[PDB]
Amino acid sequence: GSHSMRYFYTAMSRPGRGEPRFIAVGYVDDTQFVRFDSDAASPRMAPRAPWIEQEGPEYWDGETRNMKASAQTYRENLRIALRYYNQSEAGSHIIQVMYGCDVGPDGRLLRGHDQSAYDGKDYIALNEDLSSWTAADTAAQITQRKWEAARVAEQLRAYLEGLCVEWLRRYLENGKETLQRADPPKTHVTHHPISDHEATLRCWALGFYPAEITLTWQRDGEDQTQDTELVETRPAGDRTFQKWAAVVVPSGEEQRYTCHVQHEGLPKPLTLRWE
């Protein structure tokens, strides 16, 4: 199947409470495999998945050195953002960054990503061509000008087409038993009377990996989008995810409703009904 590697950085200022906290996490698909937190007693890139533990001291030392340098860069970027947005040194602000690569079954680059946000709003993003930028506002246009002068997109493109895809291929091989295993959802329909007139039908999907899933209700074969309550996919804590979709149905009409489930782990989409 198709796979991704993504790093997520968060830098948060907290004036009067020390220097900004910097936390980085790395994922392969929906599996976290590394973390770095400047607030740890001894900040270090640390393993969070069993398949990365085999990496040697040169890996952990190199990643730690890079993370400590990124923490310093993002603390500087938070100072620069105050100047670009005419903001005071008194408030708490956040920079977020997400970058990485997507590969297909053959491991070739499908797409690269490198984007950032300030205070939860898009700031600048590397375009799909890996050669130009999209700036969200006039402050990001200043960074865009700096980065075009410095040929930053070329450096990012080299990482995304090179080291990013090479290391993602390595992690997929090292973690093949889990990263390359889809766990299909365990599904069932529950029934909860609301009153004498109505009942809730809830379609459950449990124990699935990766997180991407489609759960829908139909009535007489028509999708019930507006009338369906659909919870956000949620982690179970054992690598898997859960989701449910519910509809309020008139008493005795339960058999008109069917739940439809699609997931990578299912060779064919499933149809379920109450009992």
């Binding site: 790395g26 970027n77 620069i80 953002a81 700096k146 990012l156 990013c164």
Partner: peptide, 6 residues
Amino acid sequence: RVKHLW
């Protein structure tokens, strides 16, 4: 594996 100011 992980990878200029604003």
